[PDB]
């Protein structure tokens, strides 16, 4: 298939891997920090989803250095993946408009 769809699919699979690894790594980093809430895997996975999407309900967040570094990777993976799907949609439309126009 075309590159842009393959990159999107790949980005999605990769995003999902980062969400899972990120939930797990966040708990490892945050336990040991008094006051931390990002300490059980189920809510950490939810946290990873809210981080990759930038939804920002604000109910959970890292307080340690490594928990924050993990958070940054999840954000960037999420922003990039959704940015890449947009770029893929644009490429699709540009090609179609070319066809609809006789080129």
């Amino acid at each position, epitope marked *: 298939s075309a590159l842009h769809w393959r990159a999107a699919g790949a980005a999605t699979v990769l995003l999902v891997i980062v969400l899972l690894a990120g939930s*797990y790594l966040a*708990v*490892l980093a*945050e*336990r*040991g*920090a*008094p*006051g*931390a*809430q990002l*300490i*059980t*895997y*189920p809510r950490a996975l939810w946290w990873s989803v809210e981080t990759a999407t930038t939804v920002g309900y604000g109910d959970l967040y890292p307080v340690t250095l490594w928990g924050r570094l993990v958070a940054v990777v999840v954000m960037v993976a999420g922003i990039t993946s959704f940015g890449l799907v947009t770029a893929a949609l644009a490429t699709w439309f540009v090609g179609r408009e070319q066809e609809r126009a006789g080129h």
Partner: antibody
Amino acid sequence: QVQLQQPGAELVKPGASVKLSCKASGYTFTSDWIHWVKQRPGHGLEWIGEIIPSYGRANYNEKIQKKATLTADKSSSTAFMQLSSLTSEDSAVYYCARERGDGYFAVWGAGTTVTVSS
Amino acid sequence: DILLTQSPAILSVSPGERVSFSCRASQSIGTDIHWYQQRTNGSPRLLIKYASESISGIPSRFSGSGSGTDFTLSINSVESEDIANYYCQQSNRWPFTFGSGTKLEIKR
């Protein structure tokens, strides 16, 4: 069948150290945490610390004098707690418990009675 | 760290009566409270998780409720085997902490 196996007792001379063990069977995941809880006679349960065997990381009750050091041997599925320089205050039953990373202690060991005496 | 207060320390009830144990947290912890039962010389046993969720193997008589800072563990129709110490434990913030325990007494 018994999920968590602990020795019945350990006698320790004042000033000496002892290594308690907690052998796990049943389902085992890379995400399990093994906790240790202390209970002095007539008293409640006091959380001592925790360890995730798959990684080797340990956390401790910071609020109490640190008497313990946690380690784990992945090949024998055993978690250990090194108690050092003990006094009669350290005499108590020490439980190990398994937590699936979701906050509660699903199953507990029978406990090891530690007596600090000469 | 979160202080879990269990008062009263001893609860006396008559046979077959509904009984309620109280557990109060120093700050809001959602429903991240779990209950354990510990009979004489036995090890703790999980009774209720996340305030009101059932554990397989535990009698229907046991139930839990509450959210925020105030929690309750109830037993419909107390019977002799229920004589024990009851503890609450939170997992909302690190480190996990335990309540001071409530002993159940039956007046026969």
